Homo-oligomer: 204 residues x 4
Amino acid sequence: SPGVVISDDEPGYDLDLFCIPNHYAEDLERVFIPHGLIMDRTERLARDVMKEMGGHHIVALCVLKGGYKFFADLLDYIKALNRNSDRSIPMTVDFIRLKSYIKVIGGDDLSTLTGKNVLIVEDIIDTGKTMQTLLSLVRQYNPKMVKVASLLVKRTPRSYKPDFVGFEIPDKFVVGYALDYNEYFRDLNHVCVISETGKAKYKA
Amino acid sequence: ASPGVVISDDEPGYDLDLFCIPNHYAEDLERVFIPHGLIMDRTERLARDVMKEMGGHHIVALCVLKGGYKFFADLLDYIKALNRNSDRSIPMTVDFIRLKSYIKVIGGDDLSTLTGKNVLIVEDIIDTGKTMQTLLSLVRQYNPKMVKVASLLVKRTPRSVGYKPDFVGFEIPDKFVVGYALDYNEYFRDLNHVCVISETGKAKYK
Amino acid sequence: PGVVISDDEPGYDLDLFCIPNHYAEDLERVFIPHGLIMDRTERLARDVMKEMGGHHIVALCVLKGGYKFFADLLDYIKALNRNSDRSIPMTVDFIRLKSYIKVIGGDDLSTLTGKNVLIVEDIIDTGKTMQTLLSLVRQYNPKMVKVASLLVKRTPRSVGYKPDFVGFEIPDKFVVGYALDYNEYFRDLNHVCVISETGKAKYKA
Amino acid sequence: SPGVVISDDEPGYDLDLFCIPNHYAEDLERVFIPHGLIMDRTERLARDVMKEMGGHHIVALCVLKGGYKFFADLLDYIKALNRNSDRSIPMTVDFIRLKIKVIGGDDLSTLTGKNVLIVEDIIDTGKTMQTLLSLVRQYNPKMVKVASLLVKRTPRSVGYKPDFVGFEIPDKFVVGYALDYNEYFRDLNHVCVISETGKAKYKA
Ligand SMILES: Nc1nc2c(ncn2C[C@H](COCCP(=O)(O)O)COCP(=O)(O)O)c(=O)[nH]1
Ligand SMILES: Nc1nc2c(ncn2C[C@H](COCCP(=O)(O)O)COCP(=O)(O)O)c(=O)[nH]1
Ligand SMILES: Nc1nc2c(ncn2C[C@H](COCCP(=O)(O)O)COCP(=O)(O)O)c(=O)[nH]1
Ligand SMILES: Nc1nc2c(ncn2C[C@H](COCCP(=O)(O)O)COCP(=O)(O)O)c(=O)[nH]1
Ligand SMILES: [Mg+2]
Ligand SMILES: [Mg+2]
Ligand SMILES: [Mg+2]
Ligand SMILES: [Mg+2]
């Protein structure tokens, strides 16, 4: 499954139809994915993750910063399953950053991943090359399995497909739900599209 | 004064496999029409819209059972979230009614409790608008200070008598839907999403 | 037998929580934080399905005080049902109770026959109301009648009835909030709390 | 305020009165602080934070790993305020580890002239925050505040008190809500005390 497919001819939602951060009022164009829809999709993903990555000890890797929201909510939904049903597994967590100029900064020593079920949690897959690099590096420390859950996957001329996908989006730049534009819009609950005012206001 | 979130006749919905669904309704549903989380988001905005307009005086929130109960609880929860985090809040009392076509209200408090009060009527869906017009005609006999109507769903239909509610969640096609307290012969009320029933479902719960 | 709140529990200071602004002078202490109610209700929903999930459940809400507990209990029940391999469909109903007991509103009682009935209440005080309601329900031969009550009081006035599901066992004190009222007020409050003398005078009939 | 005070005699809550992670069934002793209680308290803290820090751009710093849950929940309640009020402020986020040496995170020059909120899971001796504060002040933020879910009552306290406190607890070892015992129990909803069995089970 490619996840929830949002087509190119999606107009999104008018800002005035939802509760939007006041300081971003004139900065956003449309709401592209409402927060509540992300939650419903993530709930289902949590059940698929446990069904696939059970029942050995899971190491959950959060790719900071954009992955932090999806990570926290996904784990919360996984927590809901483990405390309300039989058949569960203990989970440890770790948080990493990926550097360019490929380079894993932060997180524990990668030997912790050895012989374990590693769940990598991403915000978005664009070209897919970043995850290919990370998976190759991770694969050298020999785990039981390694899976990738990405909130977003872009339809675009690019290389990879994650094991768990929330939404398949058009080739547009989106912010919100921890996804950023120059560090901004992480403090936004919905996934949205920036306006021209916003891009110039928070330009680097 | 928005018509709410507009869902067009072209909207196909979502595959059931993309969401978590009641296991006992797996064969009884065709598509997810409005995800539960989308409802909450819209309902959150509606709560702020209601207080902007009705927060000036004491509110009597009137729930139209049974289909209205979920939208009533969630709306009030979001209104309460505002009232315990702002300097501007107003007391609220609640009451529940059931409308039987025999047109006639049933099992409520004395409607004199509406006199001089700001009444918020909460419904699940408005189709022709005849039911609400009737209810309002009865309510206005008791001279409320103000009477407003919040409806989760408003259908686009030529059968409409022209009545428009004050607060609208979603403007939907002229199609039968269930879930979120809306029912098909008392079934699907235990459904969290708003959905379209399958041929298998309507045959089993006929 | 549920979460026991002893007689000497002082509760919580008002300024430590988020409180309805129009009730700021009307409340004394927070007795049961909203989140605690949710946590306890979550477990109760699993206990309900463990005993009653084997057959079609008819859920009866006792208006008005039960409306919050009813909605939240069913939400957790639904959360279970959309994540399990097995579940049974639920139909809901809402009733009000009166004397001269007489069930006001709701469907025909014949809809309860052969079904697993869950009566959802806000509180059990003397228990006389539930004893009477249960005696009426039994007449229509349901498969099973169970009662979920959020609150049970430790009171000498208790006739001796205990519900099958209990959220909290509270002292013999008057509490408001979470759909529980004082002359129709405080239903618009998600914490179970203790009224102040200021509030008791302001809102008295 | 010292926050919600938990006494020394508080026995907590029986395990089978709540929904508990199935794999920690005999590893916990009692539920110390129910998750829902943490939420209500965190909600009030969010309002307190915004009233003191909402006058200017906020940079929220999460002290991984233990602070991650309190961080995400606190920021969510803050977001609820900001999308429902007529006045709010942009917030950027950052994640750090402490080994004073800051492990990971952006250049500390990003804190200059901004309202810095450091988010912790627990204050014990208070040494960790004091040294971090004395370092952060040297980058000249507009202000710097500290929110901690937990503050322990202990004679070896250097006397430091955070600006925002969730709960004041006795000198007991607690786990859950991202707090760990040898990297375990981070996948737990409530704050709890481990049993004798669990303590030996996950012995480092
Ligand atoms: N916030 C946001 N970021 C986007 C978007 N598209 C690509 N990116 C950058 C994606 C993430 O951000 C890059 C730098 P960062 O993680 O330090 O913020 C790139 O994915 C890696 P790959 O699969 O190899 O191309 C987007 O629509 N929104
Ligand atoms: N569950 C469901 N019910 C629908 C739908 N359309 C009309 N109805 C009947 C709804 C009410 O039917 C009466 C039975 P009830 O209120 O006891 O459930 C809407 O009425 C609105 P109006 O035409 O303006 O008087 C629908 O798509 N789903
Ligand atoms: N708000 C509130 N109501 C209380 C309380 N104790 C009894 N009641 C009234 C309870 C309800 O009686 C009438 C109130 P209602 O018509 O609003 O439901 C007593 O429970 C029934 P029983 O077991 O037969 O004694 C209390 O502490 N707070
Ligand atoms: N999980 C847990 N950790 C506890 C506890 N008490 C102190 N700690 C260690 C707290 C953190 O130290 C452990 C290192 P870590 O951040 O890598 O987990 C002490 O707070 C810092 P300070 O105020 O300067 O003394 C506890 O009850 N549970
Ligand atoms: Mg990323
Ligand atoms: Mg209706
Ligand atoms: Mg009652
Ligand atoms: Mg810490």
